[PDB]
Amino acid sequence: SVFSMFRYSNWLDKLYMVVGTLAAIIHGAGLPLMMLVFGEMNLEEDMTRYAYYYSGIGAGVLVAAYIQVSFWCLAAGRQIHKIRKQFFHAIMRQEIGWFDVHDVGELNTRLTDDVSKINEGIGDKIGMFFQSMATFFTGFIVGFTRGWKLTLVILAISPVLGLSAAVWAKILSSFTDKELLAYAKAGAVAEEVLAAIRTVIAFGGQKKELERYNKNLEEAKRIGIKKAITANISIGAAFLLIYASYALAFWYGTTLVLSGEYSIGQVLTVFFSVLIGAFSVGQASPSIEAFANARGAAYEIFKIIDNKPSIDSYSKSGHKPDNIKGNLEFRNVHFSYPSRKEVKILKGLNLKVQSGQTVALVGNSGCGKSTTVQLMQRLYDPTEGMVSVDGQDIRTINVRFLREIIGVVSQEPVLFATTIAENIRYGRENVTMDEIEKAVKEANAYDFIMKLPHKFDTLVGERGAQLSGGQKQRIAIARALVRNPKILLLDEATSALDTESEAVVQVALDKARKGRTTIVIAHRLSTVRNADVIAGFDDGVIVEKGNHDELMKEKGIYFKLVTMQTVSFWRIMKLNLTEWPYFVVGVFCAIINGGLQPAFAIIFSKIIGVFTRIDDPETKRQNSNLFSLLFLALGIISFITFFLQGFTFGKAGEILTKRLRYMVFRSMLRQDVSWFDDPKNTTGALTTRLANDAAQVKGAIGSRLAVITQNIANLGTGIIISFIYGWQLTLLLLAIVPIIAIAGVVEMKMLSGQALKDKKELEGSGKIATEAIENFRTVVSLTQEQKFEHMYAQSLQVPYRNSLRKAHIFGITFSFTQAMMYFSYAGCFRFGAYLVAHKLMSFEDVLLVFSAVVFGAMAVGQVSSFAPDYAKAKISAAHIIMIIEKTPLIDSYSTEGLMPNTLEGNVTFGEVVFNYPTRPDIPVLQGLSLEVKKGQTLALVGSSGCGKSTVVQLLERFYDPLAGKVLLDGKEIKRLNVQWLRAHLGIVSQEPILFDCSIAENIAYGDNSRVVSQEEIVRAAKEANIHAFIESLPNKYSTKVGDKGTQLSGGQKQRIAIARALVRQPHILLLDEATSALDTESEKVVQEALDKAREGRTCIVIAHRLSTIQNADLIVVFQNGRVKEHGTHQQLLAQKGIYFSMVSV
């Protein structure tokens, strides 16, 4: 795209752009300007006039440097902020369909890490390039007078290399787009790895994920190596061509000296102007590289942005009528998911409801009830149907007004990482704490909210990870109530709610059911006992209908179901000791590179000396041709050396960066679950941290490091040529060097300080946005997108200003340093005039030293341009090094310990007292004791949030026990090798996590370190009562499951997880609420399958069905960390304990 990074000017941006361009023009063209005056060289009088001219040019140089840097960087910051804001606004704008079809996992790394370069390369370097252009131009103008004839020759080289830059730019643009796509894929893989890090650490599947990340990284490294070798070879060949054109012009001048067309002075001035143009191109060399990278990233970003979605999330066209009744109309609604447009989910179903009438939808698993609820939500438009509310077409009314006039409760709701206060406030724009308290009371959330510390300040973990399932469901119910809408959409609202809790919630909802057009769905007949209208589900059709009495008399699906129920400075380099010889070759190439920089002056002096040595013109021409040949040979060696140097730097840097990213992933996986629990160490937080750290580390360690080393060798050899030639003059130029070096320390310190905090704010924005994308479904449900955008805008407020400040600081520093160098050059000229009057040193030697310092001058300035990159890289490398250095409490990769191959299947917990890292103030464990023998299917029961999941997690060794001892067959869990057991046992989490992979792939994840057999997968799926449905599904087992299994109905996911656990065939199984939401027939099938393999594998069972726990060998009660009763199901049944009370309710 042309101006791909600009789509709005206004007076403001238009004037900013104009002024930046004009000021840079003065800068670039100003470079060959002071050069012309130098070439133009009573002798003392002219020396003073020229030195004063040099001082004036230097003062203007400071002025222009600051003006351009600052103004163009201010405009660039405005543009970058506008780009990010528009990107996020559109990202929210898109319809659900694009998110479903596309793998949103990339955006998290692409939203941040790329956006960085999108503006970075498209701003900082840009002014330079602009200025450089004028330079060449003015430099050519310099030669226009300096032997106009010879000047036309170089003119030919201008486009000869000009078109070359454009071509290399486009090629690198394609290469960078490919690299970015690969990087986005790697980031999506890492993000998905992070979010379910729990399960991944559970199954010990670390190796496979690590290999996947290394694979994406290797592909990216190959793409980068191609691009970087290309760019370095481009530099080398360009250098060779510049030297060749110079040699041709040298032969031309040799001819012209005898030709009499021009004097030697004019030709030398033309040669100086040509070398100035050479410096301009060398400056633009990297300026064209960033231009291209940014062009590719901007193409991609705006292409993602430009999409206008059909279900617009902001349009106000839709009507929002005042008088609305609780009447809905569904007719001939036939629709299918866009993840798989073939499968028909809606078979032309039709429904009806009335305000205050609660319509219950009960059917078979996968009936599409969640689909019906989402369709009501208008999240996706139906394929065919006239779904309308209160007569008016759903598409007719305003989308925002409708969505705000609706509430929904998800089957497995996800809680953002805030405090319950903020989560609830998300329910409505304006909520009174009186409303909050009323809602919490309605949802039974007051009990736990009060009991735990931070009553409303309790910051919930990611996705509500820090609270047990019951609490999350209560909080979600409270959120929905807080919405206080005219049409509620509770769906499977009771999943783990305690019988007392479930009854209380249902009674409260009914108490307020009068005004609400709710649509209840639930698997417990108690919840649908009072359902006003009960409808069955059968292949996308509704048959059984009417009152519960009507269905019971019909002996329909409802009747059958009812009956069935019955710091970093050099350590970063130190780590890269593997690249020792690539670095060595780079160093040798750069060494000669530097010497060459100021060596050009020695060549010019020798050329003049040959021209003025002998009067005879035959010998003169012979010597001139010999000099031209020597220059061409040196140019060939130089082209070779520069490309070898560039290749060495690029390859070593890419190797280092890939190694760093891979090792960081290895450690991040090797860290502890608690470290993930760390809010600062969040999922999106971890991903963005990794991406930005690696990106900055390379961006310093990349070709820029090579250019800085070359400038250091260049300016270095420059000052060196002065010492040999001049004495008592270059000493001044060098004694001043440290003065400018002092301004660099200040700049570096200030930039590092600014960057730490600005990057912290950027990472905060990244975690916020990552959560926004990952739970985009809930956000759509709550229509809280605008608040998300505002929070992101505020996040952007910090480093927007921070970068404005850093741009001002860098501009001032650069302008002051350049002007100081120009003042030093004018002063060296003045010292030379004084010395000439003293007549102690050769005037031509002074000319050579002045020219050599001018040659090193471009090098010095550009190295001045490495300050903020170097600081950012130091900071990023510090963070990465620290992250790698950590060795966790339980190290996954550390195999030291034992290995009880003779597993006796004997579990014993004694005085097990333990608390959560986020719930240390919340005593979760009190030292309860339990014992399980071989094939003992122990079941634990207790009140909501009785820590039940905590016993399972602790058995996971996810967290060691504050007090007590958990052994295994008479062996402490700590003593044995953790990996042996972690693979050995299997568990089924209460809200299981999938991976956006084939169902076959997910299941195969059930066992790792062993190739899964399609026969084994078939057997497990059959055992799970999901083989039939999966076969009914197209793509058999290769079906690509949505994000976190976002495409399979809840029973589907739970059955798949159970199959995964059974596949592991472990001696110890853990079923946390194993029938969270499944058909009673499905529950029976699962229980029968589990029983059929009961013997030989000890089991722990958790669920909220009396029948499910009835078969449990020994039931265990939970009472505030105390086991009140422990015995048979019949023992508790005979006893009038709380088990019996709950069973009754």
Residues that bind Mg ion (CB under 5 A): 370, 411, 469, 948-949, 990, 1050
Report the site for ligand ATP in 1039-1058 (rule: CB under 6 A).
Answer: 1042, 1046-1052
The yes or no reply on residue 234 touching ligand ATP (CB under 6 A) is no
Give dist(CA 535, CA 537) in Å, integer. 7
The yes or no reply on residue 415 touching ligand ATP (CB under 6 A) is no
Give dist(CA 581, CA 658) in Å, integer. 18
Interacting partner of 1039 out of Mg ion, ligand ATP, none (Cβ under 5 to 8 A depending on kind): none
Q: Is 366 annotated as a binding residue?
A: yes
The yes or no reply on residue 334 touching ligand ATP (CB under 6 A) is no
Pick one of 190, 202, 274, 345: the residue that binds ligand ATP (CB under 6 A). 345
Q: Is 946 annotated as a binding residue?
A: yes
533 in Cβ contact with 546 (< 8 Å): yes
Nearer to ligand ATP, 339 or 977 (CB): 339
Interacting partner of 621 out of ligand ATP, Mg ion, none (Cβ under 5 to 8 A depending on kind): none
Name the DSSP letter for residue 904.
-
The yes or no reply on residue 773 touching ligand ATP (CB under 6 A) is no
Q: Tell me the one-letter amino acid at 798.
A: V
The yes or no reply on residue 470 touching ligand ATP (CB under 6 A) is yes
Give dist(CA 114, CA 109) in Å, integer. 7
Task: Quote the least distance from Cβ 475 to ligand ATP, whole Å.
Answer: 11
Task: Quote the least distance from Cβ 1035 to ligand ATP, whole Å.
Answer: 12
388 in Cβ contact with 487 (< 8 Å): no
Q: How many CB atoms lie within 10 A of CB 1073?
A: 23
Pick one of 21, 214, 327, 339: the residue that binds ligand ATP (CB under 6 A). 339
Interacting partner of 350 out of Mg ion, ligand ATP, none (Cβ under 5 to 8 A depending on kind): none
Binding mask 123-142 for ligand ATP (x = CB under 6 A): --------------------
The yes or no reply on residue 110 touching ligand ATP (CB under 6 A) is no
Give dist(CA 714, CA 720) in Å, integer. 10
Residue for token digits 């030291």? 896
Give dist(CA 284, CA 305) in Å, integer. 30
Pick one of 199, 254, 280, 466: the residue that binds ligand ATP (CB under 6 A). 466
The yes or no reply on residue 394 touching ligand ATP (CB under 6 A) is no
Residue for token digits 């009186």? 434
Interacting partner of 1046 out of ligand ATP, Mg ion, none (Cβ under 5 to 8 A depending on kind): ligand ATP
Nearer to Mg ion, 692 or 990 (CB): 990
Q: Is 589 annotated as a binding residue?
A: no
Task: Quote the least distance from Cβ 128 to ligand ATP, whole Å.
Answer: 49
Q: Is 942 annotated as a binding residue?
A: yes
Helices and strands of the chain, counted as H and E runs: 40, 17
Antiparallel, parallel or unpaired: β 928-932 and 392-393: unpaired
Q: Is 842 annotated as a binding residue?
A: no
Nearer to Mg ion, 118 or 408 (CB): 408
User: In the bound complex, which residue of the shown chain has the CB atom lying closest to Mg ion?
Assistant: 370
Q: Residue 814 is encoded by which pair of tokens? A: 């650069």
415 in Cβ contact with 475 (< 8 Å): yes
Interacting partner of 464 out of ligand ATP, Mg ion, none (Cβ under 5 to 8 A depending on kind): none
Task: Quote the least distance from Cβ 2 to ligand ATP, whole Å.
Answer: 39
For the chain, the farthest-separated pair of C-alpha atoms sits apart, in whole angstroms, at 127
The yes or no reply on residue 489 touching ligand ATP (CB under 6 A) is no
The yes or no reply on residue 340 touching ligand ATP (CB under 6 A) is yes
Q: What is the CA radius of gyration of the chain?
A: 37
Nearer to ligand ATP, 299 or 1139 (CB): 1139
Nearer to Mg ion, 411 or 937 (CB): 411
Pick one of 206, 293, 949, 1080: the residue that binds ligand ATP (CB under 6 A). 949
* Residue 1088 burial class via C-beta count within 10 angstroms: exposed 0-12, middle 13-18, buried 19 and up: exposed
Q: Tell me phi and psi for residue 968, to 5 degrees.
A: -150, 110
Nearer to Mg ion, 370 or 778 (CB): 370
CA distances to 331, 363, 474, 549 from 531, in Å = 22, 14, 21, 11
Nearer to Mg ion, 671 or 949 (CB): 949
CA distances to 22, 131, 444, 757, 817 from 281, in Å = 19, 11, 72, 36, 22
Nearer to ligand ATP, 772 or 1103 (CB): 1103
Q: Is 9 annotated as a binding residue?
A: no
Nearer to ligand ATP, 330 or 337 (CB): 337
Q: Is 365 annotated as a binding residue?
A: yes
The yes or no reply on residue 413 touching ligand ATP (CB under 6 A) is no
Give dist(CA 759, CA 876) in Å, integer. 9
Q: Residue 770 is encoded by which pair of tokens? A: 């990552």
Give dist(CA 623, CA 614) in Å, integer. 10
Task: Quote the least distance from Cβ 364 to ligand ATP, whole Å.
Answer: 8
Nearer to ligand ATP, 373 or 880 (CB): 373
Nearer to ligand ATP, 68 or 1047 (CB): 1047
C-alpha triplet 924, 930, 936: angle, nearest 5°:
125
Give dist(CA 981, CA 273) in Å, integer. 75
Nearer to ligand ATP, 91 or 367 (CB): 367
Interacting partner of 916 out of Mg ion, ligand ATP, none (Cβ under 5 to 8 A depending on kind): ligand ATP
Q: Which of 670, 1121, 699, 680 is nearest to 870 (CA)?
A: 699
Residue 833 CA neighbour count, 13 Å, CB half:
17
Q: Is 943 annotated as a binding residue?
A: yes
**DSSP codes joined into one string, 950-1008:** HHHHHHTTSS--SEEEEEESSSBTTTS-HHHHHHH-EEE-SS----SSBHHHHHHTTS-
Report the site for ligand ATP in 954-1013 (rule: CB under 6 A).
Answer: 990
Interacting partner of 223 out of ligand ATP, Mg ion, none (Cβ under 5 to 8 A depending on kind): none
C-alpha triplet 627, 612, 838: angle, nearest 5°:
120
Task: Quote the least distance from Cβ 521 to ligand ATP, whole Å.
Answer: 7
Q: Is 369 annotated as a binding residue?
A: yes
Q: Is 356 annotated as a binding residue?
A: no
Q: Is 363 annotated as a binding residue?
A: yes
Give dist(CA 340, CA 336) in Å, integer. 7
226 in Cβ contact with 621 (< 8 Å): no
Interacting partner of 924 out of ligand ATP, Mg ion, none (Cβ under 5 to 8 A depending on kind): ligand ATP
Pick one of 428, 463, 513, 919: the residue that binds ligand ATP (CB under 6 A). 919
Residue 272: partners with Cβ closer than 8 Å, 6 or more residues away: 35, 38, 39, 142, 146, 604, 851
Interacting partner of 657 out of ligand ATP, Mg ion, none (Cβ under 5 to 8 A depending on kind): none
The yes or no reply on residue 337 touching ligand ATP (CB under 6 A) is yes
Residue for token digits 């299947």? 905
Give dist(CA 1119, CA 1142) in Å, integer. 14
Nearer to ligand ATP, 86 or 339 (CB): 339
Nearer to ligand ATP, 297 or 345 (CB): 345
Task: Quote the least distance from Cβ 925 to ligand ATP, whole Å.
Answer: 9
H or E element in which residue 877 lies: helix 867-885
Interacting partner of 922 out of Mg ion, ligand ATP, none (Cβ under 5 to 8 A depending on kind): ligand ATP
Q: Which of 708, 793, 792, 806 is nearest to 756 (CA)?
A: 806
Stretch that binds ligand ATP, among 106-114, 224-232, 238-246, 467-475 (CB under 6 A): 467-475
> Each residue of 305-324: b (16+ CB within 10 Å) or e?
beeeeebebeeeeeeeeeeb
Residues that bind ligand ATP (CB under 6 A): 337, 339-340, 345, 365-371, 461, 465-471, 496, 916, 918-919, 922, 924, 944-950, 990, 1042, 1046-1052, 1077
- Which positions make up the binding site for ATP? 363-370, 942-949
Annotated binding site: 363-370, 942-949
